[PDB]
Design a protein around this ligand. Structure first.
Ligand SMILES: [Ca+2]
Ligand SMILES: [Zn+2]
Ligand SMILES: [Zn+2]
Ligand SMILES: [Zn+2]
Length: 166
C-alpha cells in the first residue's frame, strides 16, 4: 500500500566506561513513516552479555511520555550469540497510546544489580555487580549524545522494523 510504516532508532550509552555497575542506554524512537504506530505493539531490544552480574533489574528513570507508560524486562537468551546472551526488552503499556508520524519517544534507562542501582555499596564481590560493556553487542563506546544506531532492534507486532540482530 501507499502509507509506509517506518521508524528511526537513535541511541547512546550515557556511561561508556569499559566496566560499569549500571548499563545506561538512552533511546529515542522516532516515527518517520506516515502511519500511526500503536506503542503497546512495539518492543525494543538492547543486547548484551550479563557476565557475572546477578539481581539484574530494569528501571526507567525518565521518558517524555512518563515512566509509567514504559515497561522493561531483563531477558536471558535461550540461544546466546557472541556478545549477546541477554537483552533488555523495553515496551509500552496498553494505555501508552499511539505514536503518530513525526513524533518520538525518549527513554532513559538503568539496568544492573538491584543493590548497585540504589547507590549504596552492594554486599557483593565486584564481579556480581560490575558489567564489562565492550562484550555487549548493543554498546556504543564513543557517542556522547543520540546517534542513529543499528545494533538495537525494534519490532512492531512481532515483525522486525529496525536494526540488525546479533
Ligand atoms: Ca558484558
Ligand atoms: Zn549526562
Ligand atoms: Zn574492576
Ligand atoms: Zn546472529
Amino acid at each position: 500500500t501507499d502509507l509506509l510504516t517506518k521508524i528511526e532508532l537513535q541511541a547512546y550509552n550515557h556511561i561508556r566506561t569499559s566496566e560499569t555497575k549500571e548499563l545506561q542506554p538512552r533511546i529515542k524512537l522516532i516515527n518517520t513513516g506516515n502511519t500511526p504506530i500503536t506503542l503497546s505493539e512495539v518492543k525494543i531490544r538492547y543486547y548484551y552479555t550479563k557476565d557475572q552480574v546477578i539481581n539484574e533489574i530494569y528501571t526507567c528513570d525518565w521518558s517524555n511520555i512518563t515512566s509509567s507508560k514504559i515497561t522493561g524486562t531483563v531477558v536471558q537468551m535461550s540461544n546466546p550469540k557472541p556478545n549477546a546472551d541477554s537483552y533488555v526488552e523495553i515496551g509500552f503499556t496498553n494505555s501508552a497510546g499511539v505514536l503518530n508520524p513525526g513524533e518520538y519517544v525518549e527513554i532513559i534507562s538503568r539496568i544492573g544489580n538491584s543493590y548497585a542501582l540504589s547507590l549504596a555499596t552492594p554486599p557483593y564481590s565486584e564481579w556480581n555487580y560490575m558489567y564489562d560493556q565492550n562484550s555487549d553487542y548493543s554498546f556504543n563506546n564513543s557517542s556522547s549524545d543520540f546517534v542513529v544506531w543499528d545494533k538495537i532492534t525494534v519490532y512492531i507486532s512481532g515483525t522486525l522494523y529496525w536494526g540488525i540482530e546479533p
